Amino acid sequence: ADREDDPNFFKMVEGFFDRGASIVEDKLVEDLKTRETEEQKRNRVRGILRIIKPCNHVLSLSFPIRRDDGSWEVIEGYRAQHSQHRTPCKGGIRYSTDVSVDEVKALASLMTYKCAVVDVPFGGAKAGVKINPKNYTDNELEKITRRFTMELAKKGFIGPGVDVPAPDMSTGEREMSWIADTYASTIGHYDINAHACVTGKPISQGGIHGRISATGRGVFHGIENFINEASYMSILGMTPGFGDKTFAVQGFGNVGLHSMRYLHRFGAKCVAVGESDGSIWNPDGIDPKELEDFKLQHGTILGFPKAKIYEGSILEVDCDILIPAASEKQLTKSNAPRVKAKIIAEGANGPTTPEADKIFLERNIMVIPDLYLNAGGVTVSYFEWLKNLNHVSYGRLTFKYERDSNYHLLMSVQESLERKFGKTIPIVPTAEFQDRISGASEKDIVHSGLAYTMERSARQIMRTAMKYNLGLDLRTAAYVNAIEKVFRVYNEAG
Amino acid sequence: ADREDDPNFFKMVEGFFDRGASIVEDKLVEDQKRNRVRGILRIIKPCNHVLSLSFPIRRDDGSWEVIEGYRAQHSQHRTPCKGGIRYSTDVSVDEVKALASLMTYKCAVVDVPFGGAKAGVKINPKNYTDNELEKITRRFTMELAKKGFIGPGVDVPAPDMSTGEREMSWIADTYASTIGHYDINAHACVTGKPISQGGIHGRISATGRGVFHGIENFINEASYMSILGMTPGFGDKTFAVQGFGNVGLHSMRYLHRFGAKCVAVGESDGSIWNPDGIDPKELEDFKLQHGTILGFPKAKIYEGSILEVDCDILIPAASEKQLTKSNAPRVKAKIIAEGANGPTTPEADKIFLERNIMVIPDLYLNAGGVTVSYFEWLKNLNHVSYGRLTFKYERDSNYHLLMSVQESLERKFIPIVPTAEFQDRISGASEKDIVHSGLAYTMERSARQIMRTAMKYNLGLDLRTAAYVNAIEKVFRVYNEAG
Amino acid sequence: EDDPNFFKMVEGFFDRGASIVEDKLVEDLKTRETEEQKRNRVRGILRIIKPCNHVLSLSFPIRRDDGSWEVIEGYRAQHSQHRTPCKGGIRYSTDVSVDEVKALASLMTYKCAVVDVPFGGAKAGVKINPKNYTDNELEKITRRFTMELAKKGFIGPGVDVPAPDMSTGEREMSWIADTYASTIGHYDINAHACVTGKPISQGGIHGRISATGRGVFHGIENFINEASYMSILGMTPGFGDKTFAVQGFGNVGLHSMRYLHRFGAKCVAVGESDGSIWNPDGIDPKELEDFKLQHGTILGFPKAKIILEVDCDILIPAASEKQLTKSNAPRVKAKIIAEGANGPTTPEADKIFLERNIMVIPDLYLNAGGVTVSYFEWLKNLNHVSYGRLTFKYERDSNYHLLMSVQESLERKFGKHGGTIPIVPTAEFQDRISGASEKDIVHSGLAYTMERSARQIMRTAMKYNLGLDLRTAAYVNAIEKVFRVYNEA
Amino acid sequence: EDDPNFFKMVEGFFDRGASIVEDKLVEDLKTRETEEQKRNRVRGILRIIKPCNHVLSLSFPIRRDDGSWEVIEGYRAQHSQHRTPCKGGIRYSTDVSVDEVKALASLMTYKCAVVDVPFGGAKAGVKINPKNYTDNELEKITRRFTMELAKKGFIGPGVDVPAPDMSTGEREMSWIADTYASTIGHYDINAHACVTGKPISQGGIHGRISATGRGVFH
Ligand SMILES: Nc1ncnc2c1ncn2[C@@H]1O[C@H](COP(=O)(O)OP(=O)(O)O)[C@@H](O)[C@H]1O
Ligand SMILES: Nc1ncnc2c1ncn2[C@@H]1O[C@H](COP(=O)(O)OP(=O)(O)O)[C@@H](O)[C@H]1O
Ligand SMILES: Nc1ncnc2c1ncn2[C@@H]1O[C@H](COP(=O)(O)OP(=O)(O)O)[C@@H](O)[C@H]1O
Ligand SMILES: Nc1ncnc2c1ncn2[C@@H]1O[C@H](COP(=O)(O)OP(=O)(O)O)[C@@H](O)[C@H]1O
């Protein structure tokens, strides 16, 4: 089981909504410009906040599967659609015996608010199939995936304009490919956008370039947008920028490895890396390429030659930035006063308890919340869906056009200078620009789309925080920002 | 709350399936082979789909309210699904799942080609105005339609004791105006509709007439009656009805019409008794002017149920647990006719089997409304009332037959005219007569099917197990022969 | 039907009927509302019913056979959707207008309601004179008009089902169905139900050509067999010893004469556009039809002398023209006026007939047999089978088994002494069994429809104390039915 | 735009323009036809372009906030379908007429063609004075009018895309999109493209408020 399977995490998400809804309520009635009495206005605001909170639809399924040995098995599955204020719905599919209707409902609500902070036009959704994937062959997993897709499609729980699922830590790109293939072959055969019914697909099936590193890149951009803001950094007693900064990552998965790599690339020194099985530490620095290569040949980071065996988690290691990148409860009321980092970057869902949040606010520690920082994969999910709607890879028709314009601009500078100083002044691209031009592909535009989203959303969260004088309570600002946006869609629709 | 809201009634339905499935299992393999039979029985048992909804409603005072609702579709072996909608704070997902499964087996015993379904909206209708009940009904219809939980060929809802024909009219009107606007059969998305909206004639008494026909089919079978020590027919028979709603009143009026004497009538507030007989028209008129049957001049008051009154036929016509292990040995009736769902516990069933008391089960006896539901759905598909083009044709053929007999006899040797009863049948011929014949035929065919199933498995007076086995055999064959 | 005064008539008939039902509708309401709110609901619903809900005006191009282009103007009004699909004819005439198409659509709503045909009213008009176009150009106009209606929800088996008119026929209806089924309704299993009046080879129904005439007979028969209404007119029930006169010897007039004569009524006079004939001893319909088929006219008929004021019991205006006005209404000698066509009696003549105790059976009911059979054609196309196809042989065997049972029972009762008692069908029954086809079931459906609607109109007239004002009773009956659909929805 | 003389003006502008292009259009025809048949094609096509192809007149009920019912009269003309969808505003005014809606639809066809906007012209009018109605009643009118247009092919992302007017605004456009996406266009991924002039929170575009003024400058 994960932190996302924990019933206490579901109560947390509900509490974050309740806190945010009570803060926006008073300001929403003032901004209502409708020709109603003040009593009608408050009823409308409270009424809409009451509609937003619960999941609109939950589908429970029972479907048969014939095992490879010939015996039959009844599979139990569910999918919750929290909100339709934005269609289609969006959300992953978990294959786990630890799934429940309450999990699927809470994670669907979390997805609604996460999409709203990063301006992704989808309501939240979440599915769960109550099976342990380790107990099934690839053929049986395909049968389960294809039949589950069929039952969701017949009831409006999968479709390019209805609900677009995605993979999870328990599911992958091959299962997403089977979902799209089943939908396009049967229910969505007459739909030109049938392959946009699901994201996380392989590149050969309509997948998007830049999906594997989307979350890690989003964690970097999120830290970057706050670490370059001198107003927030002066409050933490630090200088802006990644230079002369130290960081520690708890969880060396795909998000842990990618964050570690991009922070290192910008001058930040990794002093410690934590894993499910022990931790490593080096105050002089840990190279991400050397550590990734070690883990790929030994299965673990334990025994890394250029680091010491640190006992337990690295949450209390002396660093500037702490990055919880694993889906588990890590920061609690007992270890929050022992945290030595000034910035806590949540690169996973729910690593900090509400009691730890309170301690961090008292200690002037900035927590960049999961609702914002863990939205990179969600942002590139949106771009994959758009790519399938577009029916073309990003930049396909404009890369060569841009390249010729760049050369024409450099030639114009060269000719103008030769004319001004008389007669050669060669104006050529740098080694880095030439490499960008030669290797120009879809991933560069997806990375750009993600960087712009994390930057625009960081400023939105900073503005929402300064409006309600929340200071370093970025989590409440992100929830208030999400609830304000969802409220306005319902209010202006009638 | 009702007996249909009780969690113990859900366990009962599950137990009836488990009992029936273990009995058919051995005979199904005869007709790797045991894996297919057990596998299909494992697929049949749980509900395939359950939809949970949360939808807003603006009250008449201006305030908003979030309404919680659900709809379960137990089976799609037959499409569309079919099942009522309950408006009650006592509804639950487990209720809606168990009642959907009950509807799959009930439809199968009466050869109604629908999978089972059931909906529930967690509200107390007494706390809402008619305008608010319309808002709830129309929004619930919209949310079901968008997810495949209402449609002429997908899922056809119906009313309940908590809902009526006005709500069904709103469902059909909302569906035909929005989601099903392009569907020629949009008005077939729901049954229990008023006549002005595509409803069928003969829907009001459908359940009551089904109870009468169900009883009549066993009461006129001398093989079953000799085992109970009785003569066939309703003549010289006595009966008692527990629950004087619409089913109890109709069943009382129909048995009386055929010679059976009503010795006792039970109600939620006390009961009345007269060994010489109670007239149904006199009792109905008394209740319509006083609100209760208490104080009826031609009967004596009794504080308690009539379940232990000396009679031949006992008719539990109210949806509540009445026959339990404590009062089952005190029952003096030889036939127990279940006019409501779940009035007898499994422990009482066992006592009745030991005492040679025949229990006509609810799965069969309470399927008259479900049968005429099928006919209303067919009427909306047909887009014409039953008999509209053939009544006059039949009348002319009958007159031509009588004229042929008259002419042949006058040639050989004489007015040949219809009887007063036949003339009245011809003159008053309307849709209700075809619906009544269709219901009587269904009840008669299903009774013989249940009798043959009971004789095939040597079940004797265990008609409930026979009805469940009959239903499971039919549902199994659809899955098995489809692949 | 092109006359603006006829549109004002239909509007006036609605206004008269709506004011009569208004008081009884509030009293019959069982809703949880105040009395002032219940009155607002009744007037509000009557205000919704009166005007046409939708009117579509079209402009579409046509390439003439000479190569030149022409812009054709057309319209279709759907008066009501309380019952879907809509139903109504298509007129090809330069005299069509939006007001015509709106008034005739409203008339069709009330006509469908009195005979329990579940369709809202509709009417289309294409502003062209069909005599100025070739068959190829008429096909082009028909197919393009069908396309423009289909794209806007003005034709479809479950949306709007058009029909022919006096200006249009079965070939045009066939082109409508063929255009719809080949393009917009290609994926519809019921595409051929998008229009009625089709030829038999295209899904048409048997019994369509004589539908109006059979309905005119059945409408008369249902009031003539009612002793209560006949005692008020000083007559005995039944067609025996009854005399009748028919004004207009077309398909309706001839058929009405043919069926009335078959039941004992004696035709004393027949009127035509060119003169009239008269014989108090009787005129044979078969002899008169054969004479007209070989001479083009009824003038010079040997068994008659060379008819609204003729002494008879039943007067049947069967031609679409103003015949009964305030000037000749006091000279009418008939006790029953059977309107076999639209608008033969003015409102002033209706008043005179009510004062003189003359029963006028209204066109809204009596001239609705064609509409009744149109519903059956639409049903036939939905059924995808002809009526009786699977049951004629079954019924025949049951009839023989019944006669055999009577024969065996009598031979058993009277013994061998006496002999065989053959029980065989009459010559008429044998002919019915041998020639059993769809038209016999369509004729049954029509007779039952007229019978049931006659009793409904009688009950409405008794409910509102209208007496012999059957026109107001038919309009009130139609408005009550349309109101109840809106109110209970 | 309510003035009958303005409608005659638009008709006169078309007649003037059509007579000028007529002579040059026959020369540019490269089809294998006779010169007389070439002129028949040009004049024939100009005769098709001039009138509105479709005009829908509606009568729909509305329950006022006081409980009383009111029958609302409305219309929508689609001048041309040479480019689909059609495009055009909705006016809420007691001064609207079928002739207004037809002339302004034709004006929109030619306006879209000069700015290479691929839409045919369209125009709607609802015969009501918005000042006499509450916001709740204006929402009821807007949602019911949307329903009646959608059922007859007079609103849809690929059929006819309405817009606001000086008498209507972004809240009404939001109600149109919400009604269409909830009922008739529920299965359409592009349901929110059924109308323009929407608020930003409902799919509106940035730069819409200053669009006419900027175009006047440009
Ligand atoms: N998931 C969402 N829920 C609610 N509102 C949203 C959501 N995503 C975006 N919005 C808001 O809807 C509006 C759409 O604006 P637009 O300019 O089209 O998109 P964006 O600026 O997000 O790229 C913005 O105000 C945006 O903040
Ligand atoms: N709800 C049901 N589930 C399973 N089988 C059914 C159901 N209803 C009917 N059947 C069976 O399906 C078959 C249909 O037979 P058919 O003669 O067409 O209909 P019926 O005899 O019931 O009028 C029969 O064997 C019938 O018993
Ligand atoms: N065109 C119509 N408009 C309104 N009500 C109608 C119309 N046609 C029929 N009705 C009524 O609707 C109801 C339908 O009853 P039903 O028994 O299904 O049909 P019918 O008896 O006409 O064959 C009847 O009360 C009938 O009078
Ligand atoms: N509303 C319209 N009606 C007719 N032709 C149009 C209309 N809008 C654009 N066109 C023409 O159609 C062609 C489309 O050309 P294209 O290059 O695809 O578009 P554009 O140049 O307008 O961006 C052009 O010749 C353009 O002038």
Residue numbers in the entry:
A (entry chain C): 61 to 483, 487 to 557
B (entry chain F): 61 to 91, 100 to 481, 488 to 557
C (entry chain E): 64 to 369, 374 to 556
D (entry chain A): 64 to 281
What did the article's authors report about this structure?
An improved 2.4-angstrom resolution of the GDH complex with ADP is also presented. With the higher resolution achieved in our case, the H-bonding between the carboxyl group of D179 and the 2′-hydroxyl of ADP becomes obvious. In addition, as a consequence of the ribose C2′-endo pucker conformation, we could not observe any interaction between the ADP 2′-hydroxyl and R551, in contrast to the previous models. Of the bovine GDH residues involved in ADP binding, K548 corresponds to human/mouse K545, known to be acetylated. Noteworthy, no ion is unambiguously identified in this site in the binary GDH·ADP complex, crystallized in the presence of Ca2+ (20 mM), in addition to K+ (2 mM) and Na+ (500 mM) (see chapters 4.1 and 4.2 of “Materials and Methods”).
Glutamate dehydrogenase (GDH) plays a key role in the metabolism of glutamate, an important compound at a cross-road of carbon and nitrogen metabolism and a relevant neurotransmitter. The latter enzymes are hexameric, organized as a dimer of trimers, possibly forming complexes/aggregates of higher molecular weight. Mammalian GDH is one of the first allosteric enzymes discovered; its allosteric inhibition by GTP and activation by ADP have been known for more than half-a-century, but the structures of respective complexes have been characterized only recently.
